[PDB]
Write a protein that binds this DNA or RNA. Structure first.
Ligand SMILES: Nc1nc2c([nH]c(=O)n2[C@H]2C[C@H](O)[C@@H](COP(=O)(O)OP(=O)(O)OP(=O)(O)O)O2)c(=O)[nH]1
Ligand SMILES: [Mn+2]
Ligand SMILES: [Mn+2]
Ligand SMILES: [Mn+2]
Ligand SMILES: [Mn+2]
Ligand SMILES: [Mn+2]
Ligand SMILES: [Mn+2]
Ligand SMILES: [Mn+2]
Ligand SMILES: [Mn+2]
Ligand code: NA
Length: 326
DNA sequence: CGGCATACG
DNA sequence: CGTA
DNA sequence: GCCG
């Protein structure tokens, strides 16, 4: 059948129900904009279920028995199957509230709470925000200045270039340290909104203090347009033909003992990790995050040398990153 | 009905 | 509050 | 919104 947790089934990047999943994810997004995290989760999970199916849904009957499809999500699918559009979805798409909250929350440094307050205050455009910078954090000023570049898809060419310069700085910061590409590109995506890198060292403990040294070295190369420890949310200056563009890059450091858990978490998808942690706690009684896996009965952490170890600890069939596109 | 992942900056 |  |  179809299991109820996304981490129990392979989900490929491309699939056979793209239009149906896209529509449900509009409703999930809108639910988030209104603070309804429960409805967001259900709509996300229902969309993910369709991603995992082996063929296109053609008839409403094919939804019977599928987890996370109830009256609401099935009606969305029925309208799409019958009319090619779902009236609720189209109403969301063209609502001023949805459009403005999408524009605002996609600014680096702006979340749902900030976007909602700005919306209530009457603000609607990026130029509205730029007219009174005094109301902005340093992070939001950077997100607004570079917003256009940050809206341009990051390509694989860009990733190769960025990894080499990151490796150069990491190599000077700490000989022997390694750089691993994570995030959506590791799941096989050809584009991204940013690049994610996970940094470690084979000798436990030697990675301590590493990220400041890396950042200082990238800074003195003039590559850091913005940055603010274990996680650095940066904007890199990336060369382009006769120019350059700003690119969001995340750098994260973990000791080798935690590296499998950090690799798993930063490789995503977001829904996959939420479902994996939910499964861990509620089905296995184990607590999972990007640092480790904790047995609260025996008060001990599971040692893992690989992602494969973690799936085994959780009694789940192993899924390569390419099949974690929940 | 309660739950809905779980961290760091 | 923001970030992943 | 859906599940157990
Ligand atoms: N954006 C985000 N990522 C999260 C969260 N929680 C969590 O574990 N992650 C993990 C799973 C994500 O796939 C991974 C990388 O984050 P990301 O925003 O760069 O997403 P991504 O690489 O998959 O896709 P892209 O939008 O960057 O192209 O971090 C969260 O709340 N937000
Ligand atoms: Mn409804
Ligand atoms: Mn009809
Ligand atoms: Mn990413
Ligand atoms: Mn993104
Ligand atoms: Mn830590
Ligand atoms: Mn990222
Ligand atoms: Mn309730
Ligand atoms: Mn509800
Ligand atoms: Na944002």
């Amino acid at each position: 059948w179809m299991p109820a947790y996304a981490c129990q089934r392979p989900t490929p990047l491309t699939h056979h129900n793209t239009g149906l999943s896209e529509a449900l994810e509009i409703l999930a997004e809108a639910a988030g904009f209104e603070g309804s995290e429960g409805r967001l989760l259900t709509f996300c999970r229902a969309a993910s279920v369709l991603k995992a199916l082996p063929s296109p849904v053609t008839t409403l009957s094919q939804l019977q028995g599928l987890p996370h499809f109830g009256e609401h999500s099935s009606r969305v699918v029925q309208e799409l199957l019958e009319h090619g559009v779902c009236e609720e979805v189209e109403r969301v798409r063209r609502s001023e509230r949805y459009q403005t909250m999408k524009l605002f929350t996609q600014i680096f440094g702006v979340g749902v709470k900030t976007a909602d307050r700005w919306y209530r205050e009457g603000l609607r455009t990026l130029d509205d925000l730029r007219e009174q910078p005094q109301k902005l954090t340093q992070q939001q000023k950077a997100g607004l200045q570079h917003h256009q570049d940050l809206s341009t898809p990051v390509l694989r060419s860009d990733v190769d270039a960025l990894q080499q310069v990151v490796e150069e700085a990491v190599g000077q910061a700490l000989p022997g340290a390694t750089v691993t590409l994570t995030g959506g590109f590791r799941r096989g995506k050809l584009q991204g909104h940013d690049v994610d890198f996970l940094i470690t060292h084979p000798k436990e403990g030697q990675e301590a203090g590493l990220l400041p040294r890396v950042m200082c070295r990238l800074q003195d190369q003039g590559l850091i347009l913005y940055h603010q420890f274990e996680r650095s949310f940066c904007i890199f200056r990336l060369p382009q033909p006769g120019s350059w563009k700003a690119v969001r890059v995340d750098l994260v450091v973990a000791p080798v003992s935690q590296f499998p858990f950090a690799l798993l978490g930063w490789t995503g998808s977001k829904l996959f990790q939420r479902e994996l942690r939910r499964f861990s706690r509620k089905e296995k009684g184990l607590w999972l995050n990007s640092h480790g896996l904790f047995d609260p009965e025996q008060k001990t952490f599971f040692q893992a040398a690989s992602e494969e170890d973690i799936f085994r600890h959780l009694g789940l069939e192993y899924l390569p990153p390419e099949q974690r596109n929940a």
